[PDB]
Design a protein around this ligand. Sequence first.
Ligand code: SF4
Ligand code: SF4
Ligand code: SF4
Ligand code: SF4
Ligand code: SF4
Ligand code: SF4
Ligand code: SF4
Ligand code: SF4
Ligand code: SF4
Ligand code: SF4
Ligand code: SF4
Ligand code: SF4
Ligand code: SF4
Lengths: 571, 183, 183, 174
Amino acid sequence: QEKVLTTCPYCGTGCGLYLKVENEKIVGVEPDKLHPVNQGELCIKGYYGYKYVHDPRRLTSPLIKKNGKFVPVSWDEALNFIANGLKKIKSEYGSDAFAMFCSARATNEDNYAAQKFARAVIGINNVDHCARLHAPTVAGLAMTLGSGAMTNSIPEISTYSDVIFIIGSNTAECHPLIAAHVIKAKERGAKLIVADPRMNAMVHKADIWLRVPSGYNIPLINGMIHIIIKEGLVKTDFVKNHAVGFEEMAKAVEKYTPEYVEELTGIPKKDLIKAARFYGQAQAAAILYSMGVTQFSHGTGNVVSLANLAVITGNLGRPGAGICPLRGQNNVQGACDVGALPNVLPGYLDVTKEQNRERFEKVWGVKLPSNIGLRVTEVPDAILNKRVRALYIFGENPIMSDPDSDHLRHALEHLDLLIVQDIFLTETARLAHVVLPAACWAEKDGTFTNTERRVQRVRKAVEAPGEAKPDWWIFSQIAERMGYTGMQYNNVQEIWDEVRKIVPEKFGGISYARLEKEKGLAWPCPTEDHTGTPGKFATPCICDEGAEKQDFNHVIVGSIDEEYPFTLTTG
Amino acid sequence: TQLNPFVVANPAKCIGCKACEVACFAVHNRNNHVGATVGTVSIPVIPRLHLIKTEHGTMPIQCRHCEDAPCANVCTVGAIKREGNAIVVDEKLCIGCKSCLLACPFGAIELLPQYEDGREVFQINLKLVQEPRIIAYKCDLCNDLGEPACVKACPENALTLVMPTEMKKARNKEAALSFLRVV
Amino acid sequence: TQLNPFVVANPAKCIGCKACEVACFAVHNRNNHVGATVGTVSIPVIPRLHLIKTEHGTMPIQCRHCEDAPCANVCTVGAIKREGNAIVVDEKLCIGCKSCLLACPFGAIELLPQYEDGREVFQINLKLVQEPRIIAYKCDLCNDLGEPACVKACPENALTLVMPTEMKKARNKEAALSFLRVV
Amino acid sequence: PNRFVIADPKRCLGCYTCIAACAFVHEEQGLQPFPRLYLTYTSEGIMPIQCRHCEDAPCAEVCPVEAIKKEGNAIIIDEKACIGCKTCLLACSFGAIDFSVQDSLEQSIFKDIKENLMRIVAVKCDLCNFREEGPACVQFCPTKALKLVDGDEINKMVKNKRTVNVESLLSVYG
Ligand code: SF4
Ligand code: SF4
Ligand code: SF4
Ligand code: SF4
Ligand code: SF4
Ligand code: SF4
Ligand code: SF4
Ligand code: SF4
Ligand code: SF4
Ligand code: SF4
Ligand code: SF4
Ligand code: SF4
Ligand code: SF4
């Protein structure tokens, strides 16, 4: 009867989705024929992910733990309890009493509000998200190219035939529509080079299979680079115009030979020669990599090598070619543009520099701390050491997906005050202290930032069950109860306008009118009339660094038995 | 676009010793447990060039690598492809439809059983025993491997690799010099 | 083992008179009470080779009897076997799974109702009427009967039975004689 | 003759969308909620397998209650009269029949969806003849791997291949 445009929240690709609603309840989901990403077809989660919003077990009222059992309790006295608990812990031991766990499955306004109401209300740099476990990738790409995110745009990989190079192939079952473009790229001219230690559904369609054992892909790429250098397929103009040198990399790449990797990894010799030839003679090359490479301990130098391979060839900053990091959640990129890490500020600004702090005093509100906060891997140590008093589990269940679950479960017996603004079927809330109902993707009005840095909006279709309310008004109530200068969150539009105002250099033209007219925009976009950057990100030149010139880092093979002869992996 | 080179034999000096076919067999089956010695070859012999002897002596004939190749175009399945400068048949997609033998007039293609990993390749549903897989064999210029083994295996070095630009230029130069030396 | 012979057509001498399909239909349906005379035929006509026409001529095509036959590999029941020198279909184990139509690139197999003893065969349990039984049809080189009947019925002798081994020898001899007469 | 559906393994990601759509359409219609299209993993390639509608069935010849019958242009199970005598499971060459039991589901995303959402009889692809649209499996596929073949598309493909072969043989060498 009524159709509402929305972005599918289940993975990071982002797709148009009409939520066919009838009698206030969702009855179906439809694809958008004019969307540039999915082109009118969705995976399993898009077609049958709407049966999650009206389960009979949805949390419909606030409850609190008085004597060990939760009791149905109205909102205002629960907010009183939260306010007095935060006030007493802040009076006792200061502002370091909590670490903020903002969800990776919430809109960018949620993360911005959480950061502000943890920094401009009490004041601490203790904000984290459970999507860090791709953390070295953003560090490596920033140190190599000066770019901290995706470079190219997804639909360009199928407009014309290119060479697609996959590292740790799991795209066939992690993003079931990006691999749809890769398969659809085969217009009798797209040519695939795949490298992974396992058997997937994508390698069986690959003309060339670079099956290499886990942890041995750095020698593989080093031998690949050695082959493409020995045959003289290096674009000399690109390296002589924008790069700082060539012989420094040559001093560390010549030690690996095709025979060396032949005896080291157990792969045929003609495959590497072939794959190097197809990468070299072709003018278009896109490097995909799935979760497999990103769950490795030594991924820093590996992604550095992946970026520098594209640097030495010249397939960067051009349409149809470029490196392609992939994110595993809808709003991971929404946890980096705004501050969700203990050493970042909205606008990709580092809090360690006083210039990034002195630019906002009154436009932000209360004065901010200048110290680096607590990381997500360090706050269990503070819980065991009793150095932190509270924790904010928001919109997620960090007791199952995160590794080493038993340590966190044993750490969770530190019950002084716990706030879980979450949804049904979470054991953390059962182990928590205070539980508050929240709102899902179809109940909010916010924005999603996909892996391809495209910004779309979420439009509310169904009304909330019971007293479940969006978190913005929860945060505003808490801040007003403690006492905040002014009163925020009149609507989501004011919050997004404030985001546009605070950082106009990155995105100041991402308003509701353009997203209503256009099919989403991708930052940077410093003005309203600009059409966005993408398949360039910012590089047309490899000069996103402050020095306007990229550098290199020399790589080396690392180190890891009879007791455990079998390597265990997961996806 | 470059003209495909092709090896050719010299009937004037050829003896018919059949020492170039065996080298071709040894160099093509390097993945079938061969150690450049007799006794390690437990598989039958399959050559690529074929020797024919008639009243005007003996000569080996092989694939000329036709520019307007009929063998590639008649092949409906698409087994024969021009991957490099030379023409090479692919053994993965070939089904044995003998129409190639209706195309090539020289006749350098033979349908023979396949052999991999020192064993004969069996099929799924054929006849009660199973039947061998028959594949197309022809010369592929040894572009995938190194320098062709048919060269420097002949005792008198009869067969030579020629590509028709240098031969044409040499013949034209010789004709011009002979014409100018008389006038 | 010996390579399976297959009948081929010469399009330059064929007219399209459709006198080759009729002979094949007559010679394979002796159990359906035909006496080499129109009027005793109480069965719909089904031939084995099929004639088509394009702008550049007319000819029939038929089964090429591929050595690595895709139609035999696709069939999971195993009705298609190489009973003799040729490859044949069995009408007793066929179930009608049309996947063999998706395998043969030449399209020489057709799924049609089976006719025996002058009457249409009927399946036991299907729908209220009884559904007919459908069997594949393709050239089987007349192995059970005598010489191929498509040949000796064509007025222009466009149809020829070829042996893919002797023909290669003839082509080799002709190529050698042509090359040696010039050198 | 009969209409069926075929999936070339060149463009099948194993994304489990067709399987879930086939299950849920049959669930919301009022039939068994179990999928009738099985994903199989092999050494070289992944292809969904369903009931290629055999023109002699080898199924209605083994059913003792006469439940399986030809309707329209397909083979229909007629679930109401089926008793569970696992005889058609022996006589199916491709293995296109599974039985409506919870343990018949392999561990995958579809199992997680069906357990977070919430008679034993033989279920078979009925080609979605009750729906005015085409088959659900061919319609929801992200890469359009599956395709429905009719009685006339087979003839068109056969004629196209035959004409291409004849024209190539004429053009290249007689
Ligand atoms: S690809 Fe991702 S965003 Fe698109 S429909 Fe599937 S789960 Fe939703
Ligand atoms: S025998 Fe092999 S190469 Fe020759 S036409 Fe048939 S498939 Fe092609
Ligand atoms: S196989 Fe025969 S027709 Fe084909 S390129 Fe070689 S010589 Fe020419
Ligand atoms: S070039 Fe190679 S394949 Fe051809 S005849 Fe000589 S050795 Fe054999
Ligand atoms: S090795 Fe030389 S002499 Fe002997 S058959 Fe070959 S070409 Fe002739
Ligand atoms: S129709 Fe007959 S010959 Fe064809 S695949 Fe089925 S059983 Fe085999
Ligand atoms: S039916 Fe077709 S595929 Fe099978 S052997 Fe005959 S020509 Fe080859
Ligand atoms: S050889 Fe026999 S079966 Fe084949 S087309 Fe001729 S008459 Fe028919
Ligand atoms: S009988 Fe001979 S001439 Fe007549 S249609 Fe058949 S092949 Fe052509
Ligand atoms: S919908 Fe298509 S791609 Fe997905 S599993 Fe089914 S056949 Fe494969
Ligand atoms: S299980 Fe059902 S369909 Fe199969 S034979 Fe028994 S009654 Fe017939
Ligand atoms: S269940 Fe199997 S044997 Fe029966 S009709 Fe379907 S594919 Fe054929
Ligand atoms: S046609 Fe319908 S019942 Fe058959 S597999 Fe496809 S969706 Fe399932």
